[PDB]
Structures are given as C-alpha cells and as structure tokens.
Amino acid sequence: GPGYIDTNNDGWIEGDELYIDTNNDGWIEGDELLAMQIFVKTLTGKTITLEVEPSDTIENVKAKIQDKEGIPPDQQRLIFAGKQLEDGRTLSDYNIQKESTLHLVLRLRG
Numbered sequence: 826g827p828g829y830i831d832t833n834n835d836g837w838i839e840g841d842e843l844y845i846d847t848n849n850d851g852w853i854e855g856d857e858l859l860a861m862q863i864f865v866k867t868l869t870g871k872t873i874t875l876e877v878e879p880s881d882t883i884e885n886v887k888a889k890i891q892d893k894e895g896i897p898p899d900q901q902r903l904i905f906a907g908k909q910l911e912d913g914r915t916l917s918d919y920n921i922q923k924e925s926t927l928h929l930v931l932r933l934r935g
C-alpha cells in the first residue's frame with residue numbers, strides 16, 4: 826500500500842515523496858500522511874512489514890501481526906532495542922520511527 830506523490834511538483838519522485846496509502850484506494854487522504862512502515866523480524870519466519878502510525882498502541886501492532894501471520898496477541902511479545910514493549914502505549918513514546926525493526930518472541934504454552 827505504499828507509493829509516491831510528486832509534492833514538490835518538480836516532475837520527479839524523491840525519497841520524501843513516499844506516502845503510505847493505508848486504505849489502499851488509489852489515493853492519499855489527509856489522515857494517511859502520518860502512516861509509516863516498520864518491520865517485524867518474526868521468530869521462525871521472515872521479516873514482515875506493517876503500515877502503522879505513531880499514535881498506534883502495541884495491542885494494535887499485535888492485532889496487525891495476527892491478521893498477517895496467524896498468531897494471537899496473548900502469545901506475542903514484542904521487543905525493540907532491548908525493551909519489552911508494553912500495552913496501552915503509542916509507538917512514538919517508545920521512539921519507534923519509519924523503518925524501525927521489532928523482535929517477535931513467542932510464549933511457550935507447553
């Protein structure tokens with residue numbers, strides 16, 4: 826859902842002219858201007874890309890991981906730069922930014 830818009834109107838497409846089209850219509854609407862991409866290195870799989878925003882909470886992110894990889898949020902733990910990412914937290918208050926990368930840890934059960 827990423828893509829590009831020539832906002833400086835210079836005829837070309839630059840690095841700052843990436844925008845993430847959240848709603849996957851052909852467009853970029855005002856509310857998708859903060860959307861960004863972050864990666865998650867899954868445990869047993871590959872590195873996976875998410876379309877999140879800085880205001881999103883961790884439960885959100887996990888919600889997204891489930892949708893994508895089929896793991897339940899209670900079974901997920903997420904790690905960034907050594908810190909256990911806790912619930913009810915924006916990922917801007919952890920200082921997670923465009924193209925940051927997260928660690929999936931999975932609980933035992935058995």
Ligand SMILES: [Tb+3]
Pocket residue numbers: 830831832833834835836837838839842
């Ligand atoms: Tb341009």
Ligand SMILES: [Tb+3]
Pocket residue numbers: 846847848849850851852853854857
């Ligand atoms: Tb759109």
